[PDB]
Structure formats: C-alpha cells, structure tokens
Design a protein around this ligand. Sequence first.
Ligand SMILES: Cc1cc2nc3c(=O)[nH]c(=O)nc-3n(C[C@H](O)[C@H](O)[C@H](O)COP(=O)(O)O)c2cc1C
Length: 115
Amino acid sequence: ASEFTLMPMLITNPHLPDNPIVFANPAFLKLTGYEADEVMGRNCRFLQGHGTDPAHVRAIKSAIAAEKPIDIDIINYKKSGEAFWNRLHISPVHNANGRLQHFVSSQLDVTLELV
Ligand SMILES: Cc1cc2nc3c(=O)[nH]c(=O)nc-3n(C[C@H](O)[C@H](O)[C@H](O)COP(=O)(O)O)c2cc1C
C-alpha cells in the first residue's frame, strides 16, 4: 500500500485555472486537519486567514509568477480554525525541456520555533 514522505507535500497543476492542488500527502492532511477531497482542486490560499500578512502572500505570488522557488514562513489556519506558522518551501518543477510542469511544496508547522 502507498507510502509517502512524512514531510507535508503538495503538488499543484499550473496548467489548470488558479493552479489547483492536484496532490496532497497524508502528512499535509494531518498537519492541516483537512480531508484530501477538501483540498484537491483548490488553490492553496484557502489556508490563509485574517492574521496572514498580505506581504507574504504577494512575495509568494511574485516567486510563482517568476517560476522561482521561495522559502517563507506564513500564518495559516487548520480546518479547526487554529492558527499556525507554516514554513513553506515552494519550487517550480520544470521538464528537461525547460517547460513548467508542476509546482511542488514542503510545509511544516514551525509555531514552536517562532513563538
Ligand atoms: C505548490 C504550492 C504550495 C503552496 N502552499 C501554500 C501554503 O501552504 N499556504 C499558503 O498560504 N499558500 C500556499 N501557496 C500559495 C497560494 O497558492 C498562492 O500562490 C498565494 O496565495 C499567492 O497568490 P494569490 O495572491 O492569488 O492568493 C502555495 C502555492 C503553491 C504553488
């Protein structure tokens, strides 16, 4: 049966409108309290909320638009509403031919480090 990295991971498909999540591993679903069918097909921004710094969101949007990687700590929210610091690593995935195919991320709850 399936096994995945124990680090939270998402893959999104930028060929679909709004770059939706197409894969979330069980580690991400454990981290955020969501079900796979609640996260797949959505842009990851649903994790943000009233405490999320708009500057962080713009830095991510910028890196994505540039197809560059970004490492950023951002305030996000579990399904329960519980706020946490999410250490986000986002990378584009480019084919050997150079064309953008996916984005992939690592996520980690770093609340205990920052608070
Ligand atoms: C692979 C990937 C993973 C992402 N993971 C998160 C995440 O965990 N939390 C978050 O707030 N945004 C995450 N984002 C960022 C949002 O999807 C979006 O790019 C960001 O909010 C900037 O765009 P917007 O201004 O349209 O919202 C991720 C983006 C990608 C491509």
